Structure formats: structure tokens, C-alpha cells
Design a protein around this ligand. Structure first.
Ligand SMILES: Cc1cc2nc3c(=O)[nH]c(=O)nc-3n(C[C@H](O)[C@H](O)[C@H](O)COP(=O)(O)O)c2cc1C
Ligand code: SF4
Ligand code: SF4
Ligand code: SF4
Ligand code: FES
Ligand code: FES
Ligand SMILES: [K+]
Lengths: 432, 45, 263, 87, 214
């Protein structure tokens, strides 16, 4: 029953069998994979069925939220209040290491839009407002032709999949930012506003956009919904461990021989990921000094921690990090860890929206003191201060970017403390 | 028809014009339901 | 009736549902430190100084936009609440320019006063401060934008209270420049009141600039005569003459704003 | 924004003639009672002071804050104009 | 360029003659149609891109002309333009280079690609060629970090880029020929350099795992 020797995803187990664009990525190959089939029947079965199936599915927050999507998609499932309900696909993908949504938009967006309509049955929405990243210009047009064939065929729009459903799907290309990645700042970008996180409550669920309720979901979570309700959520629940239910499009990157976004069997030791599917990393296991586990926000872990940990939400949490978007970036002895997170935290300073004081001021302050840390211009107690202000901005921000900035530096402090001391110590004698 | 392993079938992303996104957006209007009315046509109004 | 019951740091107090954490605090006499919220000017929630930890909470709640429900003890003087206050206040003060002896807000500055009560007593900064280029939106109000803390209280005032959309916060990140981007001119009949709402010396009255200080100026209560509205105002007198005119609190007549001519 | 001044009562007087000193421009004043303000918890103790000293009398009631029903969802409305134009 | 205050220049002035072509009003009316009536400020974001796709940049006239055609105050138009990255308010030189520099990119030596662009093209970061060809600006992740170092030419983005690989990309782009966007190595979109791992057996047929009526 419990497949503890856990790994080796199958092509049928791969929700999207066209992630590389290998076969026909367009609508002509969509129905070949199994897409746009039996959607007429389920849409008639009522929202509770998909809610029931997703309960068995175990879909959790794949956009870094780490929350059961079944609860969230049913969170706002209330009778009509007159204000139309809406859907949003968080296709921002601004994290340095997030690529799977870029692949799914470019190659299999028919699963995405169908997931919107089969999802839109659950929240009882009248239209979707997917937020394609502006940098994904040709991927935006890629889903437009998916939009084109799906609309006139009756699959989406009026009589959604011929089920008496007026659910639609709109497209909004961005103009460049990470802060639009978070839903509470995404909606302002949708709502003709500069991307600034919105304070909750009010939640997006009861009121998302233009004073109207709107459900926000990660790109894969909505895109995997049609398959998990077609073949069966329990089969998809057979993947992942407890509260890790399912499989994840891992994003292999860094100093790895063959960097990849494979939809690969989930809750798996990173050793199996890097060697079996990524063709090893450069120099081998001994070469890699540390690994960014699942995203830039997620604190990186060294070989001393990642020697046995499986890439699952529960094990990642107790590993003082998170799986997030499975953005696994492997990093070796040759490169300096301080320089590695230097560019990350510099990027974070280049993406704070400045709305709340802790993120606007703290991240910039972090950038300056850390830039000294690259050379080593500090004293022993500055790491403790860098510890201190990290906790100060951890959770005190309006949005989760501030503590999203706390975690990477926090993990760097706790793990390679002697490295900071010696590099800082080297700073002193060379500049004596 | 046979399953491939070294063929990319997304050549359209190279051959997208400068207005291609807008060139598909313009005629998307025919599949449009009556948009919801907020009781007015702007909050300042 | 429907007034929901809730505790504040102990003692329980009933309150109308939908009331935020602040609005329940002053019912017992608690004025939680705030920078971006004005009782008659929208709700911003960006200053994060109102952050007070609540009982059982794993995260400090933003008291401005948090509706309270049954039995939520407001841990006002709790350690982590004061810890959140200490961190957020030094963050606001980080890039602030050392202008107190030359800033007219000296002696009546909210950033100055709260740092005495809810603030540290030494600095941990070891870097260079941010410098924002000044603007010019009138000969009636000065603009020293480096002193700004981006509480956005000015832009909201223009949007609703003044009814004119000419103010905003251009930029990204630490480059949160609040102003008009293009060269513009903040002529509204209620323009002079953005001086009072600003908690810092970011905007100050040019006519009053460098003429007096808050401690020396004696205050007297009188009325406005420049208009038939007859606004209640307080007159500043020092050394035997008048320097600056401030609106008074009168919800029926003037609320707390006065016309530019009166100011 | 702090309000730890609108909680007490005072004993202010009426300002009298203030003429500049001929030499160096002072505020030479012959009002001995000008620079005295007292503090009273309530006003009935404050009025009692007026009776015992028999001074001329007028009062002003506290300007209590009318309770402003604030909200954050109103800044993002669907029909009401309370939607904010900037955040 | 790092100037969030607008200086009234003779070239970029409110009197600059900006407008739209017959097709563009059809484009913007499609943008405003996509959103419910009553709240049409959402159309501000795409209409700015329309000016991006016509003028190649945003003059102050373009933002001001957007204001009344969207029934929105001009300052809100400025706020949308100033925040977002490629809503460039200053004129750019046609080929608009975004070398990707964030931590995943620099870990696999994006500096060599940056250096190759630095020396061969001859201009520094954020600058432009003497006669309006290229503009190299360091950019963060655009959302494809799986591949090798990256550079976004206009709307055509490129990956699997070695320091040499961008050198013939910039060679042929100098002559005016646009290289094929996408990964340049044997990687097509996201499969291993050493032979693909997944996508081996044919995909399942239309409809699987029927739950009775379903
Ligand atoms: C700084 C930041 C960036 C984010 N970026 C993304 C993103 O690119 N894509 C995404 O799906 N969610 C992103 N999120 C998470 C969203 O806020 C939101 O929780 C998520 O879309 C929920 O997805 P779900 O409903 O499928 O769980 C981001 C959050 C933060 C704080
Ligand atoms: S943490 Fe605060 S300042 Fe940073 S992006 Fe979020 S809301 Fe804006
Ligand atoms: S705003 Fe306040 S703290 Fe800052 S210089 Fe002026 S008086 Fe001093
Ligand atoms: S200028 Fe003054 S009122 Fe405006 S945001 Fe800054 S501190 Fe607030
Ligand atoms: S009062 Fe809550 S942030 Fe200013
Ligand atoms: S890492 Fe180069 S695209 Fe994000
Ligand atoms: K002020």
C-alpha cells in the first residue's frame, strides 16, 4: 500500500504528457492526451464532485503557499451574492528557478484553460482572468491559439463544454515584476494598478477583483485538476507522502550536468533527482556545496542536510526550508555561497514593491550589509545583527515576500556560519 | 502520429509577429458574454 | 445588541462588529502607534507600526485592517508586540535624513515623539542613507522628500478628501518616490492641509518655514472669518504676533481641515 | 496623531497687551496672570475652582470623536465608489 | 533610467505628437471590452503595452494621451508605467537586450556572456550603441531559469547560451537577421542535455479512469 520505495514517475502519471512540446502541443494533440474528454459529464455532475475528488486528490499549494487547494477552492464556495465570481491563474513565475509554468503555458495550455473551466465549476465563476507573465510573450500567444480553438468549439465560454455554464477565460500579460507573483499583489496588476499586495481580510475568495469574488491558483494546480478528476484523485494521491499528495514538476538547475524541468515523481530524495533524470551534477555529489531546495525564498541546504531528505512538504519543513516550487538549484564548492545569495538578495531588493516599511527598508539594508559580507567588511556580531533584522522583517510585512527574503539569508546564516567568519577574517588581514 | 523523442513542434513561438498577441486579442470579441455592469461606468462617475 | 465581546490586554469590552483592532483600543484609552492610518482618511496598512501581537497568535496582526471577532485579547504591552514596534520603527528611521535641528517638524514630529516612547536608544546602521531629490508643488508648501516615510497619507488625502488625482508614489523598492512624477502644481482649496496630515517634515508650510518652534508657540482658540463656514481654528502666537494657523477638531464644522486661504 | 493631551482641563486666561521693549524687541508684558494654566481631571472640580476664586466664567465641552466606521474592503468595491484610486 | 521624476525635454514633452493607427483603436477597444463596465481602469496596463509596441517606448505624451482615452487621471497612468520594468519611459535602441543575471543564471557563469556583450559590442550596461542598435541591461529571471544564461532581445528570449553561443547570436543579429528564439543547445524546451528522460511511451487515449457516470 505505502510505496515507500518512492519514485520513477510514469508518462501516464505525468499529468501533462507534452511538457517538452515533443508531440503536438496544440489543440490537435490536446485531445489525444486525454484532454477535452468527459468534461461534459463532470461539469454536469456539480461542483461538489470536483470538490469531493480534490479532497481525495490531496492537492496542496504548489505556488509556495503549501495549503490544500481542495480546502481553498471550496473556501469561497457559497451561494451567489449577485457579484460575479472569477478565476485567476498565477502565471507570473517570477521566482529565480521557476520554469514549469513557462513550459506548461508554451506547450500544454489547453490543460490549463480546461482546468479553469472544470475548476470554474467548483467556485461557480463566470470567467477566468489568468495572468500570463509579460516576459512570456510567445508563450502568451501560445495559449492564445489554445484560447482560440477552445472558445469557438464550445469547450470554454458560453455553455462551457456544453454544460450550460457561462464560464469564460481572459488573458492579461504582465509588464514585469516578481511582486505580481503573489496573489494579493497580482490582483492590483489585474485591477489596473501598480502591483502592491492587498491586506487580507478581505481575502481574494470573498472579493478578488473589481469588488468581486475571485479564486487564485497556481498554474499547475488548476492545470492538473482535469486529470485528477478524470482518471482519479486517489491515483494522484498515491503519489506524494502524507500531506504531500501528488507529483510535482521539479525544476532542476544550478551546476547540474543536465538542468531540467521534468514532471518527475514527487517526495523523492534529491540524489535520485540529480543523477537519474538530470544526468548527474558537475563533479558529482562531493562537488555540490549546497542546494537551493525548491525556490529562491526557500533557504538553501548543504550536503550535510540534504544527504537523505526527500523533496516533500513535510520533510522540507522539518529541514528548515520548503519545497515551494521544487526549484532545485545545485551549487558546488567552487562558487561562493555568499556570492550566490548576493545575486538573489540583490534581485529581491530589485523586486520589493516598497509598500510596507519592513520590506522597503529591511531588504535594502540587507543588500548593503551583505555586499560587505561578500568582501567580509564586518565584525563577528554583524551576523547576529543580520540574524536580528531578518527576524524583524520575518512576518511583519504585509505580504510573504518580506519573510520570503528572510528565509534564504536565514538559512545561509544558520548553516555556513564558519564560512562567513573565515571570509570576514580573510577580509581583515588582506586589508590590514 | 508515432511518438517522437527529438522533435520540437512549437515553431510558432519563433514566428510570432510584433502584434501577434494583439492580433489574436482583437477578434476574440466575438466570443464575449455581456460584461457585468457595476451600476455605473466608473467609480468617479 | 449585536455588539461583539472582546478583551483588550485583559479587561473585556463590547464593540460593533467590523471594528478594526485600533478602533477597539481607544475605547479603553489605548492609542496604538500608527503612521499610515488616519481616522477620517481611508485605511492604508503600510506603516506596520500598528502591528500588535494578539493572544495565541503565531503572527503579529496588522491592527489597521484586521477586523476583530469574539474573544480576541489585544496583547498591547506584550513583549513581541513591543518587539514588532521596535523593529518597524528603526526600519522607518533607517534612511531618514538627520534634519531634526533644521526640520520644522522638530518638537511636533510623530516620528520624533514615538521614537522616544516606542523606540530604541542607539543605532545599528552602518551604511549610506537614501537621498530623494526634492520636488516643487507650490509656494505655499515646501517639499523635502528625503524626510518622507512613504506613509501614503498625502496621496489618499488628495484622492478622496481633496478630490484631485495628482499625487502618487512612483518607483520601485527603496526608490519609493512619492509625488507627481511630472512637474505639476498642487492647487486645491484644501491643499494646505496635507501639511498637517504628514507625520514628518516631508511637506511643510513655506510661509511658516524657519520662523518658530512648537514648544515656544503659545496656542489660542478662535474661529475662521475668511469664509461663512466659520471654521474652528487654533492660533499660534509667540513673542506677541501670529505665525501659523491650525485647524481644530470640530466634526460638525471643519472636521480637521481648513481652506488654503484660512491657513 | 497622539492624543495624550486631550484628556485634562485647563485654567487659561485672556491675553493682555504685549508691547515690544524699546531696546532689544522683547515681549514686555504687565499681565501677571498670563502665564498660568492649571490642570483639572474633570470639569466640576474645574468649575469649583472658579467659584472659590470667583473668576469670570465660560466653559467648552469636550469634542469627543464621533466613531468613524473604518473599513479596508471598501477600498475595493464593486458598485460603491469608496474604491480607492491609489494604494 | 533611474530617474523617477520627469524632466520636460524638447523631444519628450507633452506636445510630442503621439497617436494610434486605425488598427490600434480596434486593439484598445478589445482591451477595454475584456473587462466589465464600471471598472475599466484595468485596461490601463495593456494600453501602455500598445504604445510600447508602436513607439518602442513611453513618451510623457503617450502616458498623457492614454489618460483621457482611458478616462483615468494622468498620474495613475504614470504610476503604472513607472513601476513595471520594460515600461521604459526613455527611448531605447530597437534591439533591446535583457541579459539574465539572477542567482541561477550567474551560478552557471552569466558573467562570461555579460563580458562578451560588454567587450564585443563596446558599450557598458544600460547604454546604447552610437547609432541606435543595441541596449544591454542586466535583468533578473524572466521565468525560464532551467536553461543556461539568458538574454531577452525585445520579445524574443534566448537560452542555452554559452559565452560563445551569444557571440554568433549577436553576430547575426547585428546584420538584422533575427535568430530563432529558444534554447540554442540540443535542448529543445526542457529536456536533458544528455538525452530526454520522460516522454517515452505514447500518451494515454482520450479519457481514462472513468468514475461511473463522471
Ligand atoms: C513573493 C511571492 C511570489 C510568488 N510568486 C508566485 C508565482 O510566481 N506563481 C504562483 O503560482 N504563486 C506565486 N506566489 C504564491 C501566491 O501568493 C499564492 O499563494 C499562490 O498563487 C496560490 O496558489 P494555489 O492556490 O495553487 O495554492 C508567490 C508568493 C509570493 C509571496
Ligand atoms: S513585503 Fe511589503 S514592501 Fe515588500 S513587496 Fe510585500 S508589501 Fe511591498
Ligand atoms: S521629520 Fe521629524 S525626525 Fe525627521 S528631521 Fe523632521 S523633525 Fe526630525
Ligand atoms: S510625503 Fe508625507 S504624507 Fe506623503 S507619503 Fe511621505 S510622509 Fe506620507
Ligand atoms: S496604522 Fe496599521 S500600518 Fe499605519
Ligand atoms: S534564471 Fe535566467 S531566466 Fe530566471
Ligand atoms: K507634516
Amino acid at each position: 500500500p505505502k510505496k515507500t520505495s518512492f519514485g520513477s514517475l510514469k508518462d501516464e502519471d505525468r499529468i501533462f504528457t507534452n511538457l517538452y512540446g515533443r508531440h503536438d502541443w496544440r489543440l490537435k494533440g490536446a485531445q489525444s492526451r486525454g484532454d477535452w474528454y468527459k468534461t461534459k459529464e463532470i461539469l454536469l455532475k456539480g461542483p461538489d464532485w470536483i470538490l469531493g475528488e480534490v479532497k481525495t486528490s490531496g492537492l496542496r499549494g504548489r505556488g509556495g503557499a503549501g495549503f490544500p487547494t481542495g480546502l481553498k477552492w471550496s473556501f469561497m464556495n457559497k451561494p451567489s451574492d449577485g457579484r460575479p465570481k472569477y478565476l485567476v491563474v498565477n502565471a507570473d513565475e517570477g521566482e529565480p528557478g521557476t520554469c514549469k509554468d513557462r513550459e506548461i503555458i508554451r506547450h500544454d495550455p489547453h490543460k490549463l484553460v480546461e482546468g479553469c473551466l472544470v475548476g470554474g465549476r467548483a467556485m461557480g465563476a463566470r470567467a477566468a482572468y489568468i495572468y500570463i507573465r509579460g516576459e512570456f510573450y510567445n508563450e502568451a500567444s501560445n495559449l492564445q491559439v489554445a484560447i482560440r480553438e477552445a472558445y469557438e468549439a464550445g469547450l470554454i465560454g458560453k455553455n462551457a463544454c456544453g454544460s450550460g455554464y457561462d464560464f469564460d477565460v481572459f488573458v492579461v500579460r504582465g509588464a514585469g515584476a516578481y511582486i505580481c507573483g503573489e496573489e494579493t499583489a497580482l490582483i492590483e496588476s489585474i485591477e489596473g494598478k501598480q502591483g502592491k499586495p492587498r491586506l487580507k481580510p478581505p481575502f481574494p475568495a470573498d472579493v478578488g477583483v473589481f469588488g468581486c469574488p475571485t479564486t487564485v491558483a497556481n498554474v499547475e494546480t488548476v492545470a492538473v485538476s482535469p486529470t485528477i478528476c478524470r482518471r482519479g484523485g486517489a491515483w494522484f494521491a498515491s503519489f506524494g507522502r502524507e500531506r504531500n499528495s501528488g507529483t510535482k514538476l521539479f525544476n532542476i538547475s544550478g551546476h547540474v550536468n543536465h538542468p531540467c524541468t521534468v514532471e518527475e515523481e514527487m517526495s523523492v530524495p534529491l540524489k535520485e533527482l540529480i543523477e537519474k533524470h538530470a544526468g548527474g551534477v558537475i563533479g558529482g555529489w562531493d562537488n555540490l556545496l549546497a542546494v537551493i531546495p525548491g525556490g529562491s525564498s526557500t533557504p538553501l541546504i548543504p550536503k550535510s542536510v540534504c544527504e537523505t531528505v526527500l523533496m516533500d512538504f513535510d520533510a522540507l519543513v522539518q529541514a528548515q526550508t520548503g519545497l515551494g516550487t521544487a526549484a532545485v538549484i545545485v551549487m558546488d564548492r567552487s562558487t561562493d555561497i555568499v556570492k550566490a545569495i548576493a545575486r538573489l538578495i540583490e534581485f529581491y531588493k530589485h523586486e520589493s514593491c516598497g509598500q510596507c516599511t519592513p520590506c522597503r527598508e529591511g531588504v535594502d539594508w540587507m543588500n548593503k550589509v551583505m555586499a560587505r559580507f561578500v568582501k567580509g567588511d564586518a565584525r563577528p556580531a554583524e551576523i547576529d545583527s543580520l540574524w536580528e533584522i531578518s527576524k524583524q522583517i520575518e512576518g511583519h510585512t504585509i505580504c510573504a515576500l518580506g519573510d520570503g527574503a528572510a528565509w534564504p539569508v536565514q538559512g545561509l546564516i544558520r548553516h555556513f556560519r564558519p564560512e562567513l567568519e573565515e571570509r570576514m577574517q580573510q577580509f581583515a588581514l588582506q586589508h590590514q | 502520429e508515432p511518438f517522437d523523442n527529438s522533435t520540437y513542434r512549437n515553431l510558432q513561438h519563433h514566428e510570432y509577429s510584433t502584434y501577434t498577441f494583439l492580433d489574436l486579442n482583437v477578434e476574440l470579441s466575438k466570443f464575449r458574454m455581456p460584461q457585468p455592469s457595476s451600476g455605473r461606468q466608473s467609480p468617479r462617475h | 445588541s449585536n455588539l461583539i465581546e472582546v478583551f483588550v490586554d485583559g479587561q473585556s469590552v463590547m464593540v460593533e462588529p467590523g471594528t478594526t483592532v485600533l478602533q477597539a483600543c481607544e475605547k479603553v484609552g489605548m492609542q496604538i502607534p500608527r503612521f499610515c492610518y488616519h481616522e477620517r482618511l481611508s485605511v492604508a496598512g503600510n506603516c506596520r507600526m500598528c502591528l500588535v501581537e494578539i493572544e495565541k497568535a503565531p503572527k503579529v496582526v496588522a491592527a489597521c485592517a484586521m477586523p476583530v471577532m469574539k474573544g480576541w485579547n489585544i496583547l498591547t504591552n506584550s513583549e513581541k508586540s513591543k518587539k514588532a514596534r521596535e523593529g518597524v520603527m528603526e526600519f522607518l528611521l533607517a534612511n531618514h535624513p538627520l534634519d531634526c535641528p533644521i526640520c520644522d517638524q522638530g518638537g511636533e514630529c510623530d516620528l520624533q515623539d514615538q521614537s522616544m516612547m516606542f523606540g530604541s536608544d542607539r543605532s545599528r546602521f552602518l551604511e549610506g542613507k537614501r537621498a530623494v531629490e526634492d520636488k516643487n508643488i507650490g509656494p505655499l508648501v515646501k517639499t523635502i522628500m528625503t524626510r518622507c516615510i512613504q506613509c501614503t497619507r498625502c496621496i489618499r488625502f488628495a484622492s478622496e478628501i481633496a478630490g484631485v488625482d495628482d499625487l502618487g508614489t512612483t518607483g520601485r523598492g527603496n526608490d519609493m518616490q512619492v509625488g507627481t512624477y511630472i512637474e505639476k502644481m498642487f492647487m486645491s482649496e484644501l491643499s494646505g492641509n496635507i501639511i498637517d496630515i504628514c507625520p514628518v517634515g516631508a511637506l511643510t508650510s513655506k510661509p511658516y518655514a524657519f520662523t518658530a518652534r512648537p514648544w515656544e508657540t503659545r496656542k489660542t482658540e478662535s474661529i475662521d472669518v475668511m469664509d461663512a463656514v466659520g471654521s474652528n481654528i487654533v492660533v499660534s502666537t509667540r513673542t506677541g504676533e501670529v505665525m501659523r494657523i491650525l485647524p481644530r477638531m470640530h466634526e460638525d464644522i471643519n472636521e480637521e481641515w481648513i481652506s488654503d486661504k484660512t491657513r | 496623531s497622539g492624543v495624550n493631551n486631550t484628556k485634562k482641563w485647563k485654567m487659561e486666561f485672556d491675553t493682555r497687551e504685549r508691547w515690544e521693549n524699546p531696546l532689544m524687541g522683547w515681549s514686555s508684558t504687565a499681565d501677571p496672570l498670563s502665564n498660568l494654566v492649571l490642570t483639572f481631571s474633570t470639569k466640576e472640580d474645574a468649575v469649583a475652582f472658579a467659584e472659590k476664586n470667583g473668576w469670570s466664567f465660560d466653559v467648552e465641552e469636550r469634542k469627543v470623536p464621533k466613531p468613524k466606521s473604518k473599513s479596508y474592503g471598501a477600498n475595493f468595491s464593486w458598485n460603491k465608489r469608496t474604491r480607492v484610486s491609489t494604494k | 533610467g533611474a530617474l523617477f521624476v520627469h524632466r520636460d525635454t524638447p523631444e519628450n514633452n507633452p506636445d510630442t505628437p503621439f497617436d494610434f493607427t486605425p488598427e490600434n483603436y480596434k486593439r484598445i477597444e478589445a482591451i477595454v471590452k475584456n473587462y466589465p463596465e464600471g471598472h475599466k481602469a484595468a485596461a490601463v496596463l495593456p494600453v501602455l503595452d500598445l504604445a510600447q509596441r508602436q513607439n518602442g517606448w513611453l513618451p510623457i505624451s503617450a502616458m498623457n494621451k492614454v489618460a483621457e482615452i482611458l478616462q483615468v487621471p494622468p498620474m495613475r497612468v504614470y504610476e503604472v508605467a513607472t513601476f513595471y520594468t520594460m515600461y521604459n519611459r526613455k527611448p531605447v535602441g530597437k534591439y533591446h537586450i535583457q541579459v539574465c543575471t539572477t542567482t541561477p543564471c550567474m551560478l552557471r557563469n552569466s558573467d562570461s556572456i555579460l563580458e562578451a556583450i560588454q567587450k564585443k559590442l563596446g558599450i557598458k550596461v544600460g547604454e546604447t550603441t552610437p547609432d541606435k542598435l543595441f541596449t544591454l541591461i542586466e535583468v533578473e529571471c524572466l521565468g525560464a531559469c532551467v536553461n543556461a544564461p539568458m538574454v531577452q532581445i525585445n520579445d524574443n528570449y534566448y537560452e542555452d547560451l554559452t559565452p560563445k553561443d551569444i557571440e554568433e547570436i549577436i553576430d547575426e543579429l547585428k546584420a538584422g537577421k533575427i535568430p530563432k528564439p529558444g534554447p540554442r543547445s540540443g535542448r529543445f524546451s526542457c529536456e536533458p542535455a544528455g538525452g530526454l528522460t520522460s516522454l517515452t511511451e505514447p500518451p494515454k487515449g482520450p479519457g481514462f479512469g472513468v468514475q461511473a457516470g463522471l
